Amino acid sequence: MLRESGAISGDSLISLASTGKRVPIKDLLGEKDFEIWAINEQTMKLESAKVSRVFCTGKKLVYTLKTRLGRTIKATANHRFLTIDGWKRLDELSLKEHIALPRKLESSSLQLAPESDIYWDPIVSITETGVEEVFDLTVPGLRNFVANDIIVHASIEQDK
């Protein structure tokens, strides 16, 4: 059994752990060996992880996902997000379902100061937007990264 890998809009802003800035994934095309923020599901802590490659799978239909806090991203229907019950494709998600947001951001204060590295935010809407070039990252090990301040699954590498 092979799962099908997802992709996100080129406008998605990727958080660079070392640089501390956010760059659209389209600008990282062809780049490698740079650091991103990813969640370790076991420890549930945010770690710095290296990207092995950035690639484009062409023009595909993307959907806009919005959360209660206003986090937004455009992704293919098969792209996976982190829920309480594990990774779920965009077309598997239900309204009011919680997805993982990083608490650590490129700011002085954490996400929810008033009250361990993840904030669970409900989905308010998923809407079909249109067709545009979509990209993904390969993150050996953790296999996820922060895009538009949302935890998103990285490329699904299929050795076999």
Numbering used by the authors: -6 to -1, 1 to 109, 116 to 160
Can I see the authors' text?
Inteins are protein elements that remove themselves from their precursor proteins in an autocatalytic pathway called protein splicing. In the first step of the canonical class 1 inteins, the scissile peptide bond upstream of the intein rearranges in an N–S (or N–O) acyl shift involving the cysteine (or serine) side chain as the first amino acid of the intein (residue 1) and the upstream flanking amino acid of the N-extein (residue (–1)). The M86 mutant of the Ssp DnaB intein (here referred to as WT intein) was selected by sequential directed evolution for its more general activity and is one of the few known intein mutants with improved extein promiscuity.
The M86 mutant was previously selected by sequential directed evolution from the parent Ssp DnaB intein23 as a more general protein splicing catalyst with regard to the flanking amino acids, a highly desirable trait when choosing a ligation site. Importantly, whereas the WT intein showed no or only very little activity with residues larger than Ala, the M86 mutant was able to splice efficiently with all tested amino acids, both in cis and in trans. In summary, we have further investigated the high sequence promiscuity of the M86 intein and reported its crystal structure. Notably, the structures of the WT intein and of M86 as well as of its mutants are overall highly similar (RMSD = 0.6 Å), suggesting that the differences in the splicing activity must be rooted in subtle structural alterations that can only be identified after careful analysis of local geometric parameters. When the WT and M86 intein are compared, slight changes of the backbone φ-, ψ- and ω-angles are observed at the N-terminal splice junction, which may correlate with the altered activity of the M86 mutant. The carbonyl group of the scissile peptide bond is slightly shifted between the two structures, a finding that is also reflected by differences in the ω-angle. This angle is closer to 180° of the perfect trans conformation for the M86 intein.
